Amino acid sequence: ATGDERFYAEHLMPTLQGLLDPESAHRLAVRFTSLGLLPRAFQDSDMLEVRVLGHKFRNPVGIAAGFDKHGEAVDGLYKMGFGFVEIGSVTPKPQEGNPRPRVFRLPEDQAVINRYGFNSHGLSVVEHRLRARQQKQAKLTEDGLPLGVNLGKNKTSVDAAEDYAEGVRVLGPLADYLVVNVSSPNTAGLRSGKAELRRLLTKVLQERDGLRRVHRPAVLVKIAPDLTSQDKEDIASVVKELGIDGLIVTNTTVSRPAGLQGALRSETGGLSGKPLRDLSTQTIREMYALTQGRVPIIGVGGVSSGQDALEKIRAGASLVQLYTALTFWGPPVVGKVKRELEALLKEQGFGGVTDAIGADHRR
Ligand SMILES: CCn1c(CO)nn(-c2cc(O[C@@H](C)C(F)(F)F)c(C(=O)Nc3c(F)cccc3Cl)cc2F)c1=O
């Protein structure tokens, strides 16, 4: 462990989180990151490179959606050491989200509960923000640092599929991949038969296919950790039938695992961090098997170490993301996870990340 890792985790982060409300802490982090005011970041080795979704990824550790909802801090996030950045969720029209407070810390559980409710600057604002750096991003992507854009829907929209279609049209041309986020716990009706998922995704794929080739992103579906076995079967079937490019597994949980200690455990919202970790890993495992290992998965939920990352990779993830760990460990967590993952890959006889993807299924 580095000097910075210990100082951030043992002293700086607990101190700052003790002085700030949770949403203020989030907002300041976005500001600092946007300005590049960051501790020095670990040099990515060849072992960490992954080729998937039509792109090179210099390392397999990404920032999950929700940290940079409005695409304000993309360059700072690459500076932090992330191999890829996902922004959003972005809704078609601007919207405020839920009333404050809407983010809650559970430090005794290394967890967070949020009910932001898709607060979003909206597609137009985000479009113009990404256009301002569109060629810089093209070079970053060529250098193995791709960009994902996560699409949401407005609270009052009467046609969910049209909201996602609008997102594809507006931000698709600026993204390496898009995410159809049908799994927020904090918008009424979002997570809801099989035929309607098929309908929605058919429309999204048609819109994507209508973009010019150099502006044509991969399309992924991000799913909840709270799905029934039937839901998971159905999703796998639809994904294969339509040629969806990948899955993001998982969003936050509306469950409250036995054992949570935080005083705020019974707040409404999605739970993230350590209590979500294994529920998410197991969802990756099931989705990989249901798709015969032929559908790339981005694994997310409770990653704070190289071991956590490798467990998701071995379960079937090609790439991982984190968010909640950053709230407790700060920016040095990114180098920590990468260093630990490289060490474990070597210790377990893997030539690189690619060799470990889905390795548990071959035992
Ligand atoms: C879930 C909302 N949330 C929270 C509170 O739960 N904290 N938090 C968060 C909070 C963060 O720091 C808060 C305390 C801040 F900015 F005031 F220092 C950070 C973070 O990485 N900060 C940071 C940075 F951007 C750049 C340099 C140095 C630091 Cl310490 C990253 C985070 F993700 C965050 O996003």
Ligand SMILES: Cc1cc2nc3c(=O)[nH]c(=O)nc-3n(C[C@H](O)[C@H](O)[C@H](O)COP(=O)(O)O)c2cc1C
């Ligand atoms: C405060 C907060 C906001 C989030 N916002 C979004 C979002 O807008 N869209 C989305 O798909 N996921 C969102 N997520 C979920 C994360 O992307 C991720 O799936 C989940 O938090 C699990 O990862 P973690 O345990 O590493 O945080 C959010 C999570 C948190 C904590």
Ligand SMILES: O=C(O)c1cc(=O)[nH]c(=O)[nH]1
């Ligand atoms: O904006 C939110 O409330 C939100 C969206 C989402 O997809 N996941 C989450 O945990 N929160």
